[PDB]
Design an enzyme around this catalytic site. Structure first.
Site, mmCIF file in Angstrom:
data_model
loop_
_atom_site.group_PDB
_atom_site.id
_atom_site.type_symbol
_atom_site.label_atom_id
_atom_site.label_comp_id
_atom_site.label_asym_id
_atom_site.label_seq_id
_atom_site.Cartn_x
_atom_site.Cartn_y
_atom_site.Cartn_z
ATOM 1 C CG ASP A 134 -4.981 -2.109 8.044
ATOM 2 O OD1 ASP A 134 -3.972 -2.149 8.801
ATOM 3 O OD2 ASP A 134 -5.139 -1.212 7.189
ATOM 4 C CG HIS B 137 -1.585 -0.641 6.197
ATOM 5 N ND1 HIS B 137 -2.719 0.015 6.631
ATOM 6 C CD2 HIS B 137 -0.697 0.323 5.869
ATOM 7 C CE1 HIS B 137 -2.504 1.317 6.622
ATOM 8 N NE2 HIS B 137 -1.293 1.534 6.145
#
Ligand SMILES: Cc1c(COC(=O)[C@H]2[C@H](/C=C(/Cl)C(F)(F)F)C2(C)C)cccc1-c1ccccc1
EC number: 3.1.1.88
Length: 252
Positions: free
Chosen positions: A200, A228
């Site tokens: 992420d 993400h």
């Protein structure tokens, strides 16, 4: 004892972003919910209608009200602020908390602690760059001058161009960013799981791990090799870990 799993979206999103995960958990014998929080349904009023967190989280409190047994609450990113708030006010209904690369703040700490720059291992500067204030800091809106940047940063996990419009809203309320975690007493006995997204860049793994480190008490952890939005890139692996937790959150 656990009958329902409730998946809660993060900023600028809607419940439909979980569409790849819902049927997989339903195959594990769970009733699955992915509601729009308040202000996240086109035509409902949008960001200025959200009064406070009790109001923001009321679509989930409604679901928890009519659940036969106990529920698992999952928050993604900013959605973790909601599951912490809900856990405190419905601890008798929540059997487990899942933080999916989500804001996990200690009691009395607001999410802005980890979004804004700071030490140690605090800051989400990619998001603050691309998501900008509107209406005097009561709303946040993506920077549409940089579409490919928005995609590669936030929607890089989408299989195949971008997710469909049903997954998103235009303007997000700043209410969850500024509300402290009220979890106390009974709520802190609820088993907690953090699912890290290792790659992420919105919420870096250093910040993710710093949040686990600063929360009081044990936090179970599983790691996924995703950016993400793991609900786009590995729904099967993600739903598997969620269902194993729901099956016995006290032991996982
Ligand atoms: C926002 C967004 C998301 C979920 O993201 C978050 O909730 C980020 C939030 C942090 C921050 Cl600092 C902020 F809210 F400001 F972004 C975490 C809590 C770190 C997911 C997929 C697409 C978009 C997006 C959809 C359309 C256009 C652009 C992006």
């Amino acid at each position: 004892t656990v009958t329902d799993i409730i998946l809660i979206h993060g900023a600028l999103n809607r419940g439909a972003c979980y569409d790849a995960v819902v049927p997989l958990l339903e195959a594990r014998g769970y009733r699955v919910h992915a509601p729009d929080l308040t202000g996240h349904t086109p035509g409902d009023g949008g960001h200025l209608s959200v009064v406070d967190m009790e109001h923001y989280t009321r679509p989930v409190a409604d679901i928890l009200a009519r659940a036969e047994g106990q529920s698992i609450l999952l928050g993604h990113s900013l959605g973790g602020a909601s599951i912490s708030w809900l856990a405190q006010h419905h601890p008798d209904k929540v059997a487990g908390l899942i933080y999916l690369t989500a804001v996990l703040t200690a009691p009395g700490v607001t999410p802005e602690t980890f979004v804004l720059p700071g030490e140690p291992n605090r800051g989400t500067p990619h998001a603050l760059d691309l998501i900008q204030p509107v209406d005097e800091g009561r709303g946040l809106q993506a920077d549409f001058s940089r579409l490919e940047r928005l995609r590669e940063v936030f929607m890089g996990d989408y299989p195949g161009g971008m997710p469909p419009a049903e997954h998103f809203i235009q303007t997000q309320s700043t209410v969850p960013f500024g509300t402290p975690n009220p979890m106390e007493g009974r709520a802190l006995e609820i088993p907690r799981l953090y699912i890290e997204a290792l790659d992420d860049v919105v919420l870096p793994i250093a910040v993710q791990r710093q949040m686990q480190k600063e929360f009081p008490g044990p936090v179970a952890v599983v790691s996924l090799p995703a950016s993400h939005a793991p609900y786009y890139s590995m729904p099967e692996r993600l739903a598997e870990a969620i269902a194993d937790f729901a099956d016995a959150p006290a032991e996982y």
